[PDB]
């Protein structure tokens, strides 16, 4: 009771933090709620993802800015940019480690419904991908293996259990194709996946309700624009 009341209050404060654009708070609230051991609803999964996407998103944006200035200073004087980029990088790795720990300890299960299973495995691939963006050597190669494994396991489930227009399936395919292009240096595989995903969803669009149609075509436009970008 004190435990369940504690969980519902943490969820409610996460929703309040979202409204206040207090995303670090929101992530802290949702982490607390996840450790209570109860499955997250569709809504609550989105709260978790919104919170951490905003937090890591700001770190990634900062890392790219600092990395770019660092590389410009290293082209053809002062340790400051390197020192500060390294700090942001370590902090980014720590947030990714936290999300990955939550996924493995509490959220990823063989038992769930397909949508939740794919959601969390996609998230696992995403946050290994963000680690890969900042890694460099054999570390990077091993992180890349880990992201591909998570993405591919999610892809297997989505192709077995969801229709080709399902928005979670489409978003997984979008991100796994970006992984191929930008991370794994496999541009032909990225184009193939994105084109196949778009084409197989296009063939089913006529079957969708108005709300489903809106959700699916939004992600399909992203697939189409990436294909335009890459071809």
């Amino acid at each position: 009771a004190m435990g369940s009341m504690e969980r519902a209050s943490l969820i409610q404060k996460a929703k309040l933090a979202e409204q206040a654009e207090r995303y670090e708070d929101m992530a802290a609230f949702m982490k607390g709620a996840v450790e209570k051991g109860e499955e997250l609803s569709c809504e609550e999964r989105n709260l978790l993802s919104v919170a951490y996407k905003n937090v890591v998103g700001g770190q990634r944006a900062a890392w790219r800015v600092l990395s770019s200035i660092e590389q410009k200073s290293n082209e053809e004087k002062g340790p400051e940019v390197r020192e500060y980029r390294e700090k942001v990088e370590t902090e980014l790795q720590g947030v990714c480690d936290t999300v990955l720990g939550l996924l493995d300890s509490h959220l990823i299960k063989e038992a769930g419904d397909a949508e939740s299973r794919v959601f969390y495995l996609k998230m696992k691939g995403d946050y290994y991908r963000y680690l890969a963006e900042v890694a460099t050597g054999d570390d990077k190669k091993r992180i890349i293996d880990s992201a591909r494994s998570a993405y591919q396991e999610a892809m297997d489930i989505s192709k077995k259990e969801m229709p080709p227009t399902n928005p979670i399936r489409l978003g997984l395919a979008l991100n796994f194709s970006v992984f191929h292009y930008e991370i794994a240096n496999s541009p032909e595989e990225a184009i193939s996946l994105a084109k196949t995903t778009f084409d197989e969803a296009m063939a089913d669009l006529h079957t969708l309700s108005e709300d489903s149609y809106k959700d699916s075509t939004l992600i399909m436009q992203l697939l189409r624009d990436n294909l335009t970008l890459w071809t």
């Binding site: 998230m123 995403d126 928005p167 991100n175 970006v178 292009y181 624009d225 990436n226 970008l229």
Partner: peptide, 11 residues
């Protein structure tokens, strides 16, 4: 070059 789109949830 611009970066490719990724997606985790609708805006």
């Amino acid at each position: 070059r611009r970066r490719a789109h990724t997606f985790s949830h609708p805006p």
